[PDB]
Amino acid sequence: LTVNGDRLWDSLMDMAKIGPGIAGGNNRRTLTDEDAEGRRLFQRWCEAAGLTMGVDRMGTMFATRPGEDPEALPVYIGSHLDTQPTGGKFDGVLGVLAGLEVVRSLNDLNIKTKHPIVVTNWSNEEGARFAPAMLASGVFAGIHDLDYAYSRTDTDGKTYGEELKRIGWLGEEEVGARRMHAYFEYHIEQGPILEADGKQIGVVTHGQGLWWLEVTLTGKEAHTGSTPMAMRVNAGLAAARILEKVQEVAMAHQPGAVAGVGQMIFTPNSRNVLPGKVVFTIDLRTPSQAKLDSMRAIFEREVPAIAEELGVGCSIEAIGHFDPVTFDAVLVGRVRAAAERLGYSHMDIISGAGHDACWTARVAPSTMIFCPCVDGLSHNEAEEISPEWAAAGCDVLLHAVLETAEIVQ
Amino acid sequence: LTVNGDRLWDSLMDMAKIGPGIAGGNNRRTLTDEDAEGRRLFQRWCEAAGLTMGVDRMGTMFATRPGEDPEALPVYIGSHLDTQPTGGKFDGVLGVLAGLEVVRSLNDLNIKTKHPIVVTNWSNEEGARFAPAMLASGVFAGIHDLDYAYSRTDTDGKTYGEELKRIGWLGEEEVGARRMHAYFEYHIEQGPILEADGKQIGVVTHGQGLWWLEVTLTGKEAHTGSTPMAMRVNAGLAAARILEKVQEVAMAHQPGAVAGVGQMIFTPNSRNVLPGKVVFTIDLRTPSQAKLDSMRAIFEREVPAIAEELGVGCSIEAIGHFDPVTFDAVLVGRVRAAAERLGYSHMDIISGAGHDACWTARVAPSTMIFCPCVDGLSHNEAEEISPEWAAAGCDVLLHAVLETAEIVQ
Ligand SMILES: [Zn+2]
Ligand SMILES: [Zn+2]
Ligand SMILES: [Zn+2]
Ligand SMILES: [Zn+2]
Numbered sequence: 001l002t003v004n005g006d007r008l009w010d011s012l013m014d015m016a017k018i019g020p021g022i023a024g025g026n027n028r029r030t031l032t033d034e035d036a037e038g039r040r041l042f043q044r045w046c047e048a049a050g051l052t053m054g055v056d057r058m059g060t061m062f063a064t065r066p067g068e069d070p071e072a073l074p075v076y077i078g079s080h081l082d083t084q085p086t087g088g089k090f091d092g093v094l095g096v097l098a099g100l101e102v103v104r105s106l107n108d109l110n111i112k113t114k115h116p117i118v119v120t121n122w123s124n125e126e127g128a129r130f131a132p133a134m135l136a137s138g139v140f141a142g143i144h145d146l147d148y149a150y151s152r153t154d155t156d157g158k159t160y161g162e163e164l165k166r167i168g169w170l171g172e173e174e175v176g177a178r179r180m181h182a183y184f185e186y187h188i189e190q191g192p193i194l195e196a197d198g199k200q201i202g203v204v205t206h207g208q209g210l211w212w213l214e215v216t217l218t219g220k221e222a223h224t225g226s227t228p229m230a231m232r233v234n235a236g237l238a239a240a241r242i243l244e245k246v247q248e249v250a251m252a253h254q255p256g257a258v259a260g261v262g263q264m265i266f267t268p269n270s271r272n273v274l275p276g277k278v279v280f281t282i283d284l285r286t287p288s289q290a291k292l293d294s295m296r297a298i299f300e301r302e303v304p305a306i307a308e309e310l311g312v313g314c315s316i317e318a319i320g321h322f323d324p325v326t327f328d329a330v331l332v333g334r335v336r337a338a339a340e341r342l343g344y345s346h347m348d349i350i351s352g353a354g355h356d357a358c359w360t361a362r363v364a365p366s367t368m369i370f371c372p373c374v375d376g377l378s379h380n381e382a383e384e385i386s387p388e389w390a391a392a393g394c395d396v397l398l399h400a401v402l403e404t405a406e407i408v409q
Numbered sequence: 410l411t412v413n414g415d416r417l418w419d420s421l422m423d424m425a426k427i428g429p430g431i432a433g434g435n436n437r438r439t440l441t442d443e444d445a446e447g448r449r450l451f452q453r454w455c456e457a458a459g460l461t462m463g464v465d466r467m468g469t470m471f472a473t474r475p476g477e478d479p480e481a482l483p484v485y486i487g488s489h490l491d492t493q494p495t496g497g498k499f500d501g502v503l504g505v506l507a508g509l510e511v512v513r514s515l516n517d518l519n520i521k522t523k524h525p526i527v528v529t530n531w532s533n534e535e536g537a538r539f540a541p542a543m544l545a546s547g548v549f550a551g552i553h554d555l556d557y558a559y560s561r562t563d564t565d566g567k568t569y570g571e572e573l574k575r576i577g578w579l580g581e582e583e584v585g586a587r588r589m590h591a592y593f594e595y596h597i598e599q600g601p602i603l604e605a606d607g608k609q610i611g612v613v614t615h616g617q618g619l620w621w622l623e624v625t626l627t628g629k630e631a632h633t634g635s636t637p638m639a640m641r642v643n644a645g646l647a648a649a650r651i652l653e654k655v656q657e658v659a660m661a662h663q664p665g666a667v668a669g670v671g672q673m674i675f676t677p678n679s680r681n682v683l684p685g686k687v688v689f690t691i692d693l694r695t696p697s698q699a700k701l702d703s704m705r706a707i708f709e710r711e712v713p714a715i716a717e718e719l720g721v722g723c724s725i726e727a728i729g730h731f732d733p734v735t736f737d738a739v740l741v742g743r744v745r746a747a748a749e750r751l752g753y754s755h756m757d758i759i760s761g762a763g764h765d766a767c768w769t770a771r772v773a774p775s776t777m778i779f780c781p782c783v784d785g786l787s788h789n790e791a792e793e794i795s796p797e798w799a800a801a802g803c804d805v806l807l808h809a810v811l812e813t814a815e816i817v818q
Pocket of ligand 4: 493500501535788
């Protein structure tokens with residue numbers, strides 16, 4: 001049994017035509033008109049494949065294929081259609097549309113299952129327009145209330161909840177109200193491991209835990225000409241030395257830990273004035289609870305000490321956190337076995353990023369499947385997979401789901 | 410014997426009322442309409458003091474007080490009325506309005522001079538809106554042609570030359586056509602030295618030379634979750650290590666050198682994506698030619714080696730440069746002597762920043778006078794001096810000018 005990879009591929013290219021970016025990728029941020037366009041197209045496809053559409057109060061979309069057991073809970077296949085402003089075509093979209101290809105493959109064969117199958121598009125997974133990321137799955141898994149989620153505002157000062165109403169995807173359903181037999185998410189690695197190790201299938205075992213530590217450094221705004229070295233209070237240098245320490249800390253915890261900085265903000269950011277304020281986020285991740293606690297403790301001690309070294313003030317706010325996630329070992333094994341059975345090359349991998357699956361794992365037996373991506377490139381328009389990679393993992397998805405939903409024939 | 414410090418102070422407070430900033434300072438950037446308003450008020454004052462106004466093709470304003478010798482070249486008293494967006498009330502303004510106070514004090518006493526005195530408001534000294542700084546004095550001293558200066562455009566894409574015409578300060582006079590007997594500029598220190606050493610008067614002997622080395626680092630945009638440490642090409646860490654090098658190089662060149670970074674720009678600047686591009690300016694300065702060449706050479710060699718260490722691409726563009734300026738020893742001497750005779754405390758100081766004086770020094774015997782400023786604060790709305798500080802240095806200015814222009818009696 002396999003999926004129609006050509007049909008999968010075509011769907012990916014059709015969805016990529018909505019909210020196209022500036023370089024062959026996508027800018028289809030959550031709750032834009034472009035996102036509404038993608039939602040509608042997906043719904044059209046879902047209906048054409050015999051699925052009934054449910055929508056929750058966060059706008060998550062649940063497309064149900066009936067099971068033959070009316071008491072059986074559904075096997076959910078989820079991801080997200082929303083993208084980064086420099087979005088790739090495959091991040092998120094692959095998982096959603098793989099779920100759709102699974103259905104279509106089951107419809108082609110008239111397969112009946114005991115469990116219903118529900119293909120799921122989570123609202124605002126990316127957290128690019130409204131933070132946090134994984135916002136709708138967050139409410140679903142009880143991580144935060146609807147109120148909190150609704151009040152998230154974008155860089156235009158519009159709220160999530162207003163925008164959700166504006167495009168008319170404020171659904172009827174209570175968020176978190178569905179119980180899942182199981183949850184699968186198929187996604188690109190967003191990293192270079194599978195490609196570099198030549199593996200078609202990443203058997204996701206865990207998701208790495210993280211802290212986002214937002215560091216605000218307070219310097220003295222001082223002309224870089226007229227201020228002698230000995231009288232500088234240099235928040236940019238402090239930031240710099242902290243970035244070194246972050247690298248040193250990450251390296252002391254190898255293997256299987258990361259830390260680094262993506263976002264750095266100097267104020268005023270003039271060429272001839274030392275910053276009054278420097279803000280940055282230390283992103284530290286590991287599947288190892290001990291390493292995550294250890295890096296976080298180290299940062300809490302050393303970051304202000306490095307600031308203090310330069311007379312720079314320092315406050316640290318935890319703006320993101322979850323502990324390492326263990327995917328359901330039975331579902332993991334199904335994915336591993338299916339990859340073996342299908343003759344695909346495969347390895348076990350840690351999910352480096354968070355996904356909606358990391359939240360569903362709290363309320364439901366959850367796992368993920370990875371396919372490779374070229375050069376580990378993600379969150380960028382040049383993000384690439386082959387149709388062969390797309391289909392390989394969708395095949396593993398088909399098998400793992402069908403084993404879980406249970407074929408009636 | 411002295412200036413009216415009350416009248417000086419009042420003029421400062423009147424000028425600070427035009428294009429007021431957010432917080433006690435000024436946003437009266439060059440060739441804004443509020444710049445035009447400041448120009449107009451200064452002209453009104455100038456005319457009421459018996460000065461005739463000339464304007465060059467850059468909009469520099471030259472207010473002449475007659476001399477008794479019709480062949481004598483003028484003693485120029487210059488600064489600028491344009492401010493940083495978060496400008497202080499005193500930067501530039503003090504010099505121009507001190508020139509006006511000198512005139513008024515000479516008029517109060519009906520003093521005649523051999524040399525005419527010209528009060529000068531240079532256009533776009535700050536270089537906030539249209540870069541570089543010292544644009545009008547630059548053209549005056551032949552550093553750059555009118556073409557280049559006119560073609561400077563702001564962040565809105567309006568050109569300097571359009572804007573100059575818009576406000577109707579495109580003057581008749583050929584830029585650089587005036588020959589100066591002498592040039593004085595009275596300016597705040599913009600640094601903490603005079604304040605820290607309890608001196609009222611900075612006798613400026615030299616202006617430090619500079620290089621501005623804009624470094625563009627090319628990294629790999631890579632998710633900070635999904636990318637293993639060993640596969641990162643981290644342009645932000647490269648930037649960090651370069652900032653540390655910059656500090657270590659600065660500290661090796663003490664005494665009498667600076668280097669540091671005010672401007673840092675990460676792209677895309679997301680929390681979960683390592684930058685594809687980091688741009689920053691290494692601002693390095695010293696009155697020592699040897700140390701300036703040394704620092705420059707060391708950066709040109711070591712910055713790419715730091716980048717190469719991390720696999721980061723590196724490109725260095727010199728975006729600004731002038732050599733150390735020696736102010737005219739005779740005019741320096743007069744400033745020092747006038748401070749001594751008047752009983753003000755005083756020290757020799759190096760101009761940390763560039764000023765219009767540093768360009769006039771090419772075509773004319775030039776010097777500067779500094780007064781203190783609170784905490785070295787400049788290019789910020791909380792930039793502060795006392796009326797006492799303002800007046801002490803304007804007194805030294807009156808004496809130095811009158812000795813140079815020569816009293817008739
Ligand atoms: Zn995703
Ligand atoms: Zn993503
Ligand atoms: Zn100035
Ligand atoms: Zn200034």
